Coordinates of C-alpha atoms in Angstrom, one line a residue:
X14 CA -0.6 -18.3 25.6
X15 CA -0.7 -14.7 26.8
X16 CA -4.4 -13.9 27.0
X17 CA -7.9 -15.5 26.8
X18 CA -8.6 -13.4 23.7
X19 CA -5.6 -14.0 21.3
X20 CA -7.0 -17.2 19.9
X21 CA -10.2 -15.5 18.9
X22 CA -8.3 -13.4 16.4
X23 CA -6.0 -15.9 14.6
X24 CA -8.2 -16.0 11.5
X25 CA -10.6 -13.7 9.6
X26 CA -13.3 -12.3 11.9
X27 CA -16.6 -10.8 10.7
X28 CA -17.2 -7.2 12.0
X29 CA -20.4 -5.2 12.6
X30 CA -20.2 -1.5 13.4
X31 CA -23.3 0.3 14.6
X32 CA -23.2 4.1 15.3
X33 CA -26.1 6.2 16.6
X34 CA -25.2 9.8 16.1
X35 CA -26.4 13.3 17.2
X36 CA -24.4 16.4 16.1
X37 CA -26.0 19.7 16.9
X38 CA -29.3 17.8 16.8
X39 CA -28.8 16.4 13.4
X40 CA -29.7 12.7 14.1
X41 CA -28.0 10.0 12.0
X42 CA -27.1 6.4 12.0
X43 CA -24.2 4.4 10.4
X44 CA -24.0 0.7 9.8
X45 CA -20.7 -1.0 8.8
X46 CA -19.9 -4.5 7.7
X47 CA -16.6 -6.2 6.9
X48 CA -13.9 -8.4 8.3
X49 CA -10.7 -8.2 10.3
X50 CA -7.5 -10.2 10.0
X51 CA -5.4 -9.3 13.0
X52 CA -2.6 -11.6 11.9
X53 CA -1.9 -8.9 9.3
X54 CA -3.3 -6.0 11.3
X55 CA -5.8 -5.7 8.5
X56 CA -9.3 -4.2 8.4
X57 CA -11.8 -4.0 5.5
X58 CA -15.1 -2.2 6.2
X59 CA -17.9 -0.7 4.2
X60 CA -20.0 1.9 6.1
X61 CA -23.5 3.2 5.1
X62 CA -25.4 6.2 6.4
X63 CA -28.7 4.5 7.0
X64 CA -30.6 7.8 7.7
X65 CA -29.7 9.6 4.4
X66 CA -26.8 12.0 3.9
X67 CA -24.2 12.0 6.6
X68 CA -24.3 15.4 8.3
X69 CA -20.6 15.4 9.0
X70 CA -17.6 14.4 6.7
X71 CA -16.8 10.7 6.6
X72 CA -13.1 11.2 7.5
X73 CA -14.1 12.7 10.8
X74 CA -15.7 9.4 11.8
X75 CA -12.8 7.1 10.9
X76 CA -11.3 6.8 14.4
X77 CA -14.8 6.3 15.9
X78 CA -16.0 3.6 13.5
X80 CA -11.8 -1.8 16.5
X81 CA -8.1 -1.8 17.6
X82 CA -8.4 -5.4 18.7
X83 CA -7.5 -6.1 15.0
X84 CA -4.1 -4.5 15.4
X85 CA -1.1 -6.7 14.7
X86 CA 0.9 -7.1 17.9
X87 CA 4.3 -8.7 17.1
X88 CA 5.4 -11.7 19.2
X89 CA 7.6 -9.7 21.6
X90 CA 4.6 -7.3 22.1
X91 CA 1.7 -9.7 22.8
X92 CA 1.8 -9.1 26.5
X93 CA 0.9 -5.5 25.7
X94 CA -2.3 -6.3 23.8
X95 CA -5.0 -4.9 26.1
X96 CA -7.6 -5.0 23.3
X97 CA -7.6 -8.7 22.6
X98 CA -7.1 -9.6 26.2
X99 CA -10.5 -8.1 27.1
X100 CA -12.3 -10.4 24.6
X101 CA -14.8 -12.0 24.3
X102 CA -16.5 -9.9 27.0
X103 CA -14.9 -6.8 25.5
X104 CA -14.0 -3.2 26.4
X105 CA -15.6 0.2 26.5
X106 CA -13.9 2.8 24.3
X107 CA -14.6 6.5 25.0
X108 CA -13.3 9.6 23.3
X109 CA -13.6 13.3 23.2
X110 CA -12.6 14.7 19.8
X111 CA -12.0 18.4 19.8
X112 CA -12.2 20.1 16.4
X113 CA -10.1 23.2 16.6
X114 CA -12.2 26.4 16.4
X115 CA -15.3 24.1 16.0
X116 CA -17.4 21.7 18.0
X117 CA -16.4 18.4 19.6
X118 CA -17.6 14.8 19.5
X119 CA -18.2 12.7 22.6
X120 CA -18.2 9.0 21.8
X121 CA -18.8 5.9 23.9
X122 CA -18.5 2.5 22.3
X123 CA -18.7 -1.2 23.4
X124 CA -16.4 -3.5 21.5
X125 CA -17.2 -7.2 22.1
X126 CA -18.1 -10.4 20.5
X127 CA -21.7 -11.3 19.8
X128 CA -21.4 -15.0 18.7
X129 CA -18.7 -15.1 16.1
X130 CA -19.0 -11.5 15.1
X131 CA -16.9 -8.7 16.6
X132 CA -19.2 -5.8 17.2
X133 CA -18.5 -2.1 17.7
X134 CA -21.6 -0.3 19.1
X135 CA -21.2 3.4 19.3
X136 CA -23.1 6.4 20.6
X137 CA -21.8 9.8 19.3
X138 CA -22.8 13.2 20.7
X139 CA -21.6 16.4 18.9
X140 CA -22.1 19.9 20.4
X141 CA -21.0 23.5 19.6
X142 CA -20.4 22.9 15.9
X143 CA -20.8 25.7 13.4
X144 CA -23.7 24.9 11.1
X145 CA -21.8 26.7 8.3
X146 CA -18.3 25.5 9.3
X147 CA -15.9 23.1 7.8
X148 CA -17.5 20.0 9.4
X149 CA -21.2 20.6 9.1
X150 CA -20.5 22.4 5.8
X151 CA -18.7 19.3 4.3
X152 CA -15.5 21.2 3.4
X153 CA -13.1 18.4 4.2
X154 CA -11.3 16.2 1.7
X155 CA -12.2 12.5 1.4
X156 CA -8.8 11.1 2.4
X157 CA -6.7 10.1 5.4
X158 CA -3.1 10.1 6.7
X159 CA -0.9 7.6 8.5
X160 CA -0.4 8.1 12.2
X161 CA 1.6 6.9 15.2
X162 CA -0.4 6.9 18.4
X163 CA 1.1 6.4 21.9
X164 CA -0.9 4.0 24.0
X165 CA -0.4 4.4 27.7
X166 CA -1.4 2.4 30.7
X167 CA -4.2 3.7 32.9
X168 CA -3.6 1.6 36.0
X169 CA -6.3 3.4 38.0
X170 CA -8.9 2.4 35.5
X171 CA -7.3 -1.1 34.7
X172 CA -7.3 0.0 31.1
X173 CA -5.5 2.3 28.7
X174 CA -5.5 6.0 27.6
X175 CA -4.2 8.0 24.7
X176 CA -3.9 11.5 23.4
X177 CA -3.2 11.9 19.6
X178 CA -3.8 14.4 16.8
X179 CA -5.6 13.8 13.5
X180 CA -5.2 16.5 10.8
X181 CA -8.0 16.6 8.2
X182 CA -7.4 18.3 4.9
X183 CA -9.7 21.3 4.2
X184 CA -10.7 22.0 0.6
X185 CA -9.0 25.4 0.8
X186 CA -5.6 23.8 1.4
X187 CA -5.4 24.3 5.1
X188 CA -5.9 21.6 7.8
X189 CA -8.6 21.0 10.4
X190 CA -7.1 19.7 13.7
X191 CA -9.0 17.0 15.6
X192 CA -7.5 16.5 19.1
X193 CA -8.3 13.0 20.3
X194 CA -8.5 12.0 24.0
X195 CA -9.2 8.2 24.5
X196 CA -9.8 5.9 27.4
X197 CA -10.6 2.2 27.3
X198 CA -11.8 0.0 30.2
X199 CA -12.8 -3.7 30.5
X200 CA -16.4 -4.7 30.3
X201 CA -17.4 -6.6 33.4
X202 CA -14.2 -5.4 35.2
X203 CA -11.5 -7.6 33.8
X204 CA -9.3 -9.5 33.8
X205 CA -7.0 -7.8 31.2
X206 CA -3.4 -7.3 30.4
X207 CA -2.2 -3.9 31.5
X208 CA 0.3 -2.8 28.8
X209 CA 3.4 -0.7 29.1
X210 CA 3.4 2.4 27.0
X211 CA 3.8 1.6 23.3
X212 CA 3.0 2.9 19.8
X213 CA 0.4 1.8 17.2
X214 CA 1.2 2.7 13.6
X215 CA -1.8 3.2 11.4
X216 CA -2.5 3.7 7.7
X217 CA -5.9 4.0 6.0
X218 CA -7.2 4.3 2.5
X219 CA -10.7 5.7 1.9
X220 CA -12.6 4.8 -1.3
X221 CA -16.1 4.6 -2.8
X222 CA -18.0 1.8 -4.5
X223 CA -19.0 3.3 -7.9
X224 CA -22.1 1.1 -7.9
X225 CA -23.3 2.2 -4.4
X226 CA -25.9 4.9 -4.5
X227 CA -26.2 5.6 -0.8
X228 CA -23.8 7.8 1.2
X229 CA -21.0 5.5 2.2
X230 CA -17.3 4.9 2.9
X231 CA -15.1 2.0 2.1
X232 CA -12.2 1.7 4.5
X233 CA -9.0 -0.3 4.2
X234 CA -6.8 0.1 7.3
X235 CA -3.6 -1.5 8.7
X236 CA -2.6 -1.1 12.4
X237 CA 0.6 -2.5 13.8
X238 CA 2.1 -2.3 17.3
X239 CA 5.3 -0.6 16.2
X240 CA 7.1 -1.3 19.5
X241 CA 7.8 0.3 22.8
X242 CA 9.6 3.2 21.0

């Protein structure tokens, strides 16, 4: 009723995530498979580092590795920019600033290829400390729940957001990751321009005890909490 993309998400949708990564010159690639069920705001994904050992901690990649699977309640479906850009899709770009360490620059295309929702990412990381908490793998394998404020970016016919992720360091302190995000339609529209609103997130990271490769299992729920 509201957008050309809502009907594409009414059932379970297969997902493919492909990340090509370059942090300080450490080249790596990550492949993810799973499914999304936007009716319940639900994501299940298993990611594998296809190049060997991941050179950064898995938690630092969670936000980079498909908000079109957020559950928008009925009174919020006019604010669902992510589904409205489908099937052609949207570009999602971020700078992630790790406090007193380096930063990631990410550019992603989120779009359907056939029946599969694809997230194709390029990640660049610069100015990291080779012995620091990130490249030194000093972060705990866990995640917190967040509320993120999505704001309209009328000039770009998309959305923008600033939010903070706090990763646990093994010494009992936290590593701050300042996220700046912008999304824009692929093929220049049309899309729904939302008013400002919150997404509420929660994530559980786990491992497959049978899987020998470096990997991350992710179970995540995202819900449009409302305008306030």
